[PDB]
Amino acid sequence: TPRLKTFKVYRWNPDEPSAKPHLQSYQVDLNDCGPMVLDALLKIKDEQDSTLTFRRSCREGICGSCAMNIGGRNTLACICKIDQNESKQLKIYPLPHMFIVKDLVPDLTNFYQQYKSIQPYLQRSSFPKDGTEVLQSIEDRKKLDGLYECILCACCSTSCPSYWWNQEQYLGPAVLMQAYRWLIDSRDQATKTRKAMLNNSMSLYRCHTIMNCTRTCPKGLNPGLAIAEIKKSLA
Amino acid sequence: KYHIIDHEYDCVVIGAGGAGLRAAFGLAEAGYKTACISKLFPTRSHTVAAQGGINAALGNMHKDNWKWHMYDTVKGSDWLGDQDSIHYMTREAPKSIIELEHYGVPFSRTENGKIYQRAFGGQTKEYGKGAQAYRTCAVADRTGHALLHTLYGQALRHDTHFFIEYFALDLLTHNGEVVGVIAYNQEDGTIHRFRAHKTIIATGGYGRAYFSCTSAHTCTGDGNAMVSRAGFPLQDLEFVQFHPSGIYGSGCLITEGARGEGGFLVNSEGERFMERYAPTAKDLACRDVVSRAITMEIREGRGVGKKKDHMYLQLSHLPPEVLKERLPGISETAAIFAGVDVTKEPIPIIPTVHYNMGGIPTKWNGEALTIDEETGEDKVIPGLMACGEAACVSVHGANRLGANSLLDLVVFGRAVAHTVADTLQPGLPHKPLPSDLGKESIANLDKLRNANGSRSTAEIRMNMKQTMQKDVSVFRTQSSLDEGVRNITAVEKTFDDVKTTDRSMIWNSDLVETLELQNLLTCASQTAVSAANRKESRGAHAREDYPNRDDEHWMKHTLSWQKDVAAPVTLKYRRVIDHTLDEKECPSVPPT
Amino acid sequence: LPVLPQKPGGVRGTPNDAYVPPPENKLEGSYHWYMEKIFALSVVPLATTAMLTTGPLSTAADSFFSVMLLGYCYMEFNSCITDYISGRVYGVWHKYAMYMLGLGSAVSLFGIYKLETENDGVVGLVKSLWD
Amino acid sequence: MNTKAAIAEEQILNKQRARRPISPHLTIYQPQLTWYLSSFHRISLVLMGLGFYLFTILFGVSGLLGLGLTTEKVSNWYHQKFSKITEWSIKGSFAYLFAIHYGGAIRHLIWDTAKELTLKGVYRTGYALIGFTAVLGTYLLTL
Ligand SMILES: *Cc1cc2c(cc1C)nc1c(=O)[nH]c(=O)nc-1n2C[C@H](O)[C@H](O)[C@H](O)COP(=O)(O)OP(=O)(O)OC[C@H]1O[C@@H](n2cnc3c(N)ncnc32)[C@H](O)[C@@H]1O
Ligand SMILES: CCCCCCCC/C=C\CCCCCCCC(=O)O[C@H](COC(=O)CCCCCCC/C=C/CCCCCCCC)COP(=O)(O)OCCN
């Protein structure tokens, strides 16, 4: 005897541009389905209405392609687990305050132009003479833990109310953590010019320490403490 | 109805993995105009999932030698690899890990200030007789993740025009040589014609033609089907590798570093697979004998299971301090899909499809090959190159040694950019072709969009997956391989009645999945015919009716041709190269 | 308020373009961070010695509380102009909202003076208003 | 080419960019303690800073265009102006807006020295803010 849970998915069609967006309701049998949310989105597309478009690739949670807003919070659809209670429903949305392309596909073009501008590469000027690698201690390598392993899903940037309104000029908490990964690197001897891109009105100084950035990160990193140390280093 | 946009470049690279990114800025640091066409964002490729290391004979924990590394790659392939590409890869391997550190890869350090390197299986020192060596050069559990994010940030230092989210359809070809590609913009809905002098294919492997695999959702064979549709062959498609460890039910993977420092596969009786049934005296061996250890253990009854197809891997022996410093990415990926911790109870394991040791036949410098129809020698295809997993240099041969596929991307992505500069001069006029160059690839995009049949594209995809798992699998014979050829031929004649219910051209994802089904049906039909024609057993292809390895008659490769879906497949063979690049630097390794 | 014409769709160009960051203007950057932490570090101890006082404060201790309350209140009204009335979308009216935070806070400092010299303090006004 | 092929592709993409909607941001998001206890720190000072300005621009307007205002002269007009049932709806809502801003400004003087910024420390300095407000705000009524 089947157990039918009701999903409510956002819909928009760019070939009828005057139609308003709306939520559409599907019912999935939870007995023959996977335990994650992406396993129930891929059954609506195969055995039901096949015009539902979204992004996916690894189903593990390491690339960051299926970022959406599931049930009120920003998470990845292949980690979020279906609450096994068919008396309740679920509301799925795109990422908030983003210009949508088709259905759950946001336009992350501005997000990639702001990441190119922080110059994410090593900027030394000299290398050893025998052809061996440049040295680094164990206590200086430990400074990089918890920073280099961001997967760039933008689930922290599209939860920050300063990034909802001011996002054509404010860099957001996901780019400002990768700017700190290159500032405390002990092999990168270009530090004075990486603190002159951030010493203006609104590139760094729109953070008001609300902290929805550290609360909603699916990988468990802390992008709200990394902005508190850039402000303490520019003083 | 359609409108086409024309670009004009020097070199075009198709793919943004670890091989298509290393070759992209290697050509743009030399003065060339390069364009990189990618379907995903470049830091979402499948090489972000790698968790091992990169083998290199640096020698900063003990003494080492690059001639010891070469002997292990040659022996571990059952002597089907090309011995002039083993001599090139294992010599240029220390020079390419020190160069990779100057980009900013956060390698794990040692208490002298040097790179830290661990032990995988296969590498023993002093010419195959000695203790286990230590060369893997790992970042903790994110060696594949920290190698994309560094190679992508270095491609922004130079100029490389990334064309993100484009789906390449076919190669343009005029009179036996290729002159560019043709793509399809997903966000906008346009057709683009690119023209170049050398086009480089670095798409990747096909793994989604099987039911259970460790690959991504976008790992379809897209470069192998563009090449096979133009009249060029594919090589050694019968050697598929089945990983020993992998999650029961979904296909997710735990790394082989869990057995590098402490690891026991404990069955229902409670023994270690070290001898007495299906074992070599040493564990940590190559990936197919251990895969032929587990599959022979489950059928005779010596295996715990809920339906008796299941195994275990103990991790309770390890101290808790080493589980947070060496393997931190393993303790979180098992407590989600399997739901148990790594410190108290063991984890379920099944063998699934991992790697493909076959693809485009290539020389060791990057140029793609064919064969002559008069004498049977080799022949260079003008304008085409290949690198990565989609290429088959025969460095891996018949069996892949672990952590040699990340060294494969860096060494043979650096050698592609070095031999273009020695042939092609920058700035050259293009030839004027007809105005409908590539009109048979838009006539196929129109037919698959206004499609009307009885079978949907997700129903024919399931008859292909359940056929390849039933017949072309770990244990093969010539009574279940002939049933695989007659079944995969009947599936291909139902693609004529496919059904598609989305006629938009902006992010038409119902069209992209039925374009990737046309690519997987070409790659899967040539695997069932190639594997049913080789009557011997070597490497990762084990025939039960011919259990001995034959050397005097079957030491050759296989080349296969198929133009379209539902078309006959033919076979021809070419000899394997058994001499080094220099006879005085490293002598050849004889068979044993 | 009249709204300037915006970029179509929020973005303009290809992902292989780049954001061009503004020049260094640290009188609006790092030095503005210093002023917002001096007014806050001297209105928290001074208000604590106003709940422990018997009556009103002295005119040496009440003028220093009132001038440090006007700058603390100016720096937050300054930070609500630059979040909601921005020069990107309104243009001229980002500066006209910052000049009416001029003589609406220069008359306020004249109002501190005509409370302190004839009457007693600002705290002597709110303690007699009640709360 | 490649500049004629960039103008032609940006003409039909700047046309499709103008008809895309914005996805909803408020009214769908989950109520949490991180952005509910932070909107009470901007509301409480705007409602208090307006009263501080209006009572000092009144004494500084009546200095120039001289009317002669005094503290005991405006205190009768405010006391005698409102009934008893609205005298305590105004002062009953300024006592709790003063305790949530006095105790929330010490929470921000800790967060500029980069301390107490883990998720375990954002929540345990926010449970003191709801205890400090309910005790200091009720003691201020008895004065
Ligand atoms: C799957 C896997 C592999 C793996 C591993 C673990 C897993 C789960 N662990 C490894 C390890 O520990 N050590 C090791 O040495 N190797 C390990 N591997 C194998 C390794 O990951 C692969 O060999 C390697 O990732 C292959 O890299 P390559 O560059 O060849 O391939 P890719 O990264 O998958 O490339 C994907 C790109 O191709 C573009 N693409 C594909 N099709 C198209 C079309 N039609 N049009 C345009 N672009 C296309 C994609 O955009 C993507 O960028
Ligand atoms: C750190 C926050 C900064 C606030 C910025 C806002 C500007 C104005 C705010 C406050 C003005 C001065 C505060 C006075 C300090 C409280 C005094 C007190 O607690 O004493 C009470 C008086 O009761 C109160 O006043 C309660 C404090 C709440 C005051 C109003 C809250 C917000 C005020 C906004 C100002 C709006 C207009 C008011 C007058 C205009 C001039 C400021 C009773 O007197 P005693 O018996 O002598 O106390 C000794 C006990 N042993």
Ligand SMILES: C=C(CN(C(=O)c1c(C(F)F)nn(C)c1F)C1CC1)c1ccc(Cl)cc1Cl
């Ligand atoms: C409901 C909100 C949204 N919101 C903010 O806008 C915000 C911001 C950010 F917009 F810059 N920084 N700080 C400190 C805030 F309170 C809070 C939730 C985060 C709100 C709260 C008060 C006011 Cl007067 C206006 C608004 Cl609309």
Ligand code: SF4
């Ligand atoms: S910090 Fe966390 S939430 Fe933000 S982009 Fe990185 S992984 Fe995503």
Ligand code: F3S
């Ligand atoms: S949520 Fe936003 S306001 Fe700052 S502390 Fe995080 S970037």
Ligand code: FES
């Ligand atoms: S699919 Fe890659 S993270 Fe969800």
